[PDB]
Amino acid sequence: VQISKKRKFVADGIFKAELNEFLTRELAEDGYSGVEVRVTPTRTEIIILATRTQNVLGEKGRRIRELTAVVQKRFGFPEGSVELYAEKVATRGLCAIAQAESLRYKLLGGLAVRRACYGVLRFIMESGAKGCEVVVSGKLRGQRAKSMKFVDGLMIHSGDPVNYYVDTAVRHVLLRQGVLGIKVKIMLPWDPTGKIGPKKPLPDHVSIVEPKDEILPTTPISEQK
C-alpha cells in the first residue's frame, strides 16, 4: 500500500500535463483565467476561475460533467473522485488572458493583429502591469516570416527575484497563407504584491524611511505620566 514520493510526484506531473494541455486545447473560447488542482484525503479535484464565472461554469452543466467524466475515465480515477470547488479574484496581479482572448476573438472575426496589439498594450498598462511583450511570429506584411516582437515597459532578466516576475500565455490567429503565432509575456508587479509579490523589500534598494522631526533640547522639559 505504501508508495514513495518521487514516482508519485512524476505521475502527478503526468496528470497535470495532460489536464492542462486538454484545458488549453478546449477552454480557450469561454474566457477562463486561472485554473488549478487540489488534493483532499483520497480525493483529487480541479478548480477554475475567471471573470466569466458562471459562463465558465457552463450551461446545463455540460462542460462540468463532460470533462469530469473525461478525466475520470482516462486517468484511472475511480468514479466520483473529482469535483469542482469555488474561489474568487483577489486583485489584478494576473491580468493577461482577458485582453489576450479579447484581441484573439476580435481577430478571428476580422481585425488587424497590430490594432489588437495597441489595444492590449494600452489596457495592460492601464491595469497597472509593469511591462508587457507580445511576439507575433509569422507573416504580417509579405512572405518574410519576421518575428514581430512588441515590447513596452521594463524587463529584467538577471537575478534571484527574476524567477518570479514572468507570466506567459500562447495563442494563434489565422491567415490563409500562414498562421500568426502570438506569445504574450507580462512582467509581474512587485508593488501590487497581493501576497504573491515578495513582501521583502527589493534587495539592491536599501529601503530607507523618512526621519521624524522633533524639538532639539535647549532647556530640560519634563513630563509626568
Binding site: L111, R114, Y118
Partner: peptide, 30 residues
C-alpha cells in the same frame, strides 16, 4: 484596422502612401 501603427510598420513597404494618408485623415479629418 488602426492607422497609427499601420504607419509605424508600413512606411518602408509598398503601402507607405496609403497608410500615411490614412494617418493624416485620422489626425485632422476636416
Amino acid at each position: 484596422t488602426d492607422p497609427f501603427e499601420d504607419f509605424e510598420f508600413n512606411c518602408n513597404t509598398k503601402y507607405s502612401g496609403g497608410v500615411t494618408r490614412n494617418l493624416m485623415r485620422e489626425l485632422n479629418g476636416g
